[model samples]
Target: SDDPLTRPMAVERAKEWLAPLPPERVFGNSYLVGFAGLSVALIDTGAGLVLIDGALPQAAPMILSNVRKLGFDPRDIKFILSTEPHYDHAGGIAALARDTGATVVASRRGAEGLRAGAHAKDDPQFDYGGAWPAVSRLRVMKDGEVLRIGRASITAHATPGHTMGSMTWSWNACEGKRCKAIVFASSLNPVSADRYRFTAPSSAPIVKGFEASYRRMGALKCDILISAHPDNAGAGRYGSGSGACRSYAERSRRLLAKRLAEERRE
Candidate 1:
């Protein structure tokens, strides 16, 4: 597969990860509508719907199909939010937004990259990142800003590490009398293009940003944690309880530390 949006090794990995799956109800009104490798989520806000990340470009139709299978109209999606601007996470946003006429929202830098269809030069992976279909319109949100629609009020937390535009979203979902704090965390892995260096003098601020993001993630009111990659959060198999965010942050922190050490040696 020469598709630009697929990740490295994605061609071979896609055999298992891109398999068709039925829409699965995770909790409350939230459902998993993406493939095994990528995780796209949908939340019913009663008045309207809120969609999380869009998977690969080719997988865009699968997301809509899942939504229909769940007995919901894709046009009812009022907002489409993002976790990152990378192709694997945001590649299908343009198609989904066009098909549903939903408003696309992201952090300032994220909006810029999404609209341009490729990451900016400042991105850690810009040297090797692929292009996606440019988004037509986007609403930029400030860090810690709350977006309200219907009964859902989600807060976007700036968590830039993987990319300067990364964000983690949190919201409260209720099932009868029980309500849980649901967090859709962005990618915090210390990955980059082959030549990029996190320890470079020019990258000092980015390294600092990762530390702050780790602390912020650990302190969130998270009862259920869903990562951009499903496998990171137990693939939605085991119930995500308290301390999920803490564990995620700790894991990322360790990975960053090791990456920094590797850069120092290089």
Candidate 2:
């Protein structure tokens, strides 16, 4: 198939066009590429700075380097909003918070889990190298809670399922542009089925939880959708103008609705 976006020369031209945007804005650079899982960094433009999800521990140094290259002091980051309490997403929270003096924010329910160190049992893939200390600056996020950094605000929505308290960040009026929402992580893929299933044994409640969250996310209309992993939905490709990258949130929502319907029927 001849794809307009994939022509060798056209791709080269697109790369040229995208070259101006820094790696941090385009998502992580080499420092974050090799690491598994997703991590999204957002500059409110109006607000100070908010990191959606912290990447792996080993990738922290590189992530910080990328932030510095973007012309922002890493210590100035005001908030670290975690989508869920999974090891991959929450593993670097303690270290990152310590480095930036940023407050770690998570859903009230998720905060309980974080406090109990639930990721240790729930996600075996998490690395507890020196042991993640209990972050002292923890904020229990509420639904529709507005976090004002500088001039911008991110509304928190508790959309569980991927985990017990998976939350999504909605960036309103970012860069002087109105955005529908910006999700941290979702229940879309890399799972056994198209639906979300915890690492433990599959259960009806898990499937039901995913269905409800899918419906909640579908109702939103977002101009930007940022994911944890740069390789997925909204990271590396969107910065390069890939069609899939450009239309990720919309496409993912539609696919999610279809999957939910099919799952319900069965």
Candidate 3:
């Protein structure tokens, strides 16, 4: 299952792992609305709403139910954001954006792939089943740019490595006087296709991007952490955590560095 085809089997199942999901509150005004294993977030900004990642393409219905289960109208979502071009995350984004009539927001590179209905051929993990399926109606966010929906503010950090369009989002979630740094981390795993290089000239920028991502992630003020696939990153919190940002980046950095070395060895 470590190889490509088999890995998808496990990933496909993992996408629905934890089974029988019931969405819960992660922090003030934010809820863990995605189904089991996935860490989709819904942050409340007054009457407006914002959603991050769309889970699997077919999983969109479950996502909507989770939203309504949390007492929110799916159509109320003002913006939808994705972390990368990978199908696991981006596949449903196009569908949800259209369903909610929300402006889909994505990083420049990610937008290109979604508009093309697929990832760039150079993407390290080039396994796009189909274009995320919907394109056009998107707002491009730059690295470190702050995009606001009502009072909820999200800062996009372009942390390209797992995918050229990778981005980590940060926003302060508050209720009353209490607030914590909420971060939606990007995917940085070392797994990729054989055609993708880690340290060589072809994927050299990815190496640098991974390095920068680790460095920036470690420096962020993260009090609450969530991953694109929080099930894989950590599970105890169920999309909840405190003071674990540095560890996430460190672990990702170390593993990716080892993969780079292994690739060089080959």
* Candidate of highest lDDT: 1
- For all predictions, the C-alpha RMSD in Å is 2.9, 10.8, 4.9
Question: What's the TM-score of every candidate structure?
Answer: 0.93, 0.66, 0.90
Over 1-266, each residue of candidate 3 has an lDDT whose tens digit, in order, gives 23221112234475454254688888888888776666688988886899988766666667888899989999899988888867677667767876788888889998887777676876877753444465678899998899877888899999888888888889998878999888888777877876667776887778788888988888888888888777546764433445488888887988987887887683
- What is the RMSD, in Å, between candidate 1 and the native fold over all Cα? 2.9
lDDT of 1 at 188: 88
Worst 10 residues of 2 by lDDT: 27-36
Count of clashes, each model: 0, 3, 1
Candidate 3 weakest lDDT stretch, 10 residues: 1-10
| Predicted model with the maximum TM-score | 1
Q: What C-alpha lDDT do the candidate models reach, one value each?
A: 0.84, 0.54, 0.77
Ranking by TM-score: 1, 3, 2
- Whole-model lDDT, model 1: 0.84
Of candidates 3 and 2, the better by TM-score:
3
Q: What is the Å distance of residue 88 in model 1 from its true position?
A: 0.4
Regions of model 2 farther than 4 Å from truth: 1-22, 26-37, 45-47, 120-134, 173-181, 190-205, 230-266
